[PDB]
Write an enzyme that holds these catalytic residues in place. Structure first.
Site, short mmCIF file in Angstrom:
data_model
loop_
_atom_site.label_atom_id
_atom_site.label_comp_id
_atom_site.label_asym_id
_atom_site.label_seq_id
_atom_site.Cartn_x
_atom_site.Cartn_y
_atom_site.Cartn_z
N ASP A 54 33.61 64.02 46.73
CA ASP A 54 32.26 63.64 46.39
C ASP A 54 32.14 62.55 45.22
O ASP A 54 32.22 62.95 44.06
CB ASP A 54 31.51 64.92 46.07
CG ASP A 54 30.01 64.67 45.81
OD1 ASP A 54 29.55 63.54 45.84
OD2 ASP A 54 29.21 65.57 45.55
N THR A 55 31.92 61.22 45.58
CA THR A 55 31.83 60.09 44.59
C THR A 55 30.61 60.18 43.76
O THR A 55 30.64 59.76 42.62
CB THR A 55 32.01 58.78 45.30
OG1 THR A 55 30.89 58.58 46.20
CG2 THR A 55 33.43 58.67 46.05
N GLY A 56 29.66 61.02 44.20
CA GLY A 56 28.36 61.30 43.48
C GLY A 56 28.39 62.53 42.53
O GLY A 56 27.35 62.76 41.92
#
Lengths: 99, 99
Positions: A25-27
């Site tokens: 998850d880059t968020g």
């Protein structure tokens, strides 16, 4: 490897030997994992997302093997609907988003 | 272009002529932006997060310009702390997470 995103980027990791399905998850600034007990050397924390806040317990220097790589990384445990490895781990794997 | 993830992956997108900063979010199925108004051709959605659920308004075929490309995508509007581009926008653009 490459994840192309048509489908969710979900893998299995081992956290201190236990198998967990996690979402890359880059968020997420942090990594959060539901249903594993990492013991008694924790500091309570609060993290936000969409829908409000959660109380987590922060464990430092936990041992993980994922994508056939091995790292020691900070893991939070708490009541999350999906286990997420966030940027604290993506960076340590040397992962990037490319166009 | 390549995002390293040492800092959150945050870009300026225009959504029908209007500038916003969005987090590029691989763990988001959908894309959510606060403080746009897109009109009345909408369907109401429920979108689950880490903290709870939000009610949103979904719009189809929205024109978006981001990273020197132009796309038409579904965008949901609502009360999100940070603006998210999820996977529906990342795959339109052709972005991948690499190892």
């Amino acid at each position: 490897p490459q994840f192309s995103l048509w489908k969710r980027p979900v893998v299995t990791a081992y956290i201190e030997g236990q198998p967990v399905e996690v979402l890359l998850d880059t968020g997420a600034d942090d990594s959060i994992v539901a249903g594993i007990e990492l013991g008694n050397n924790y500091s309570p924390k609060i993290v936000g997302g969409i829908g409000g806040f959660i109380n987590t317990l922060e464990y430092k220097n936990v041992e993980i093997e994922v994508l056939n790589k091995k790292v020691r990384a900070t893991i939070m445990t708490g009541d999350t609907p999906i286990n997420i490895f966030g940027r604290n781990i993506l960076t340590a794997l040397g992962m990037s988003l490319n166009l």
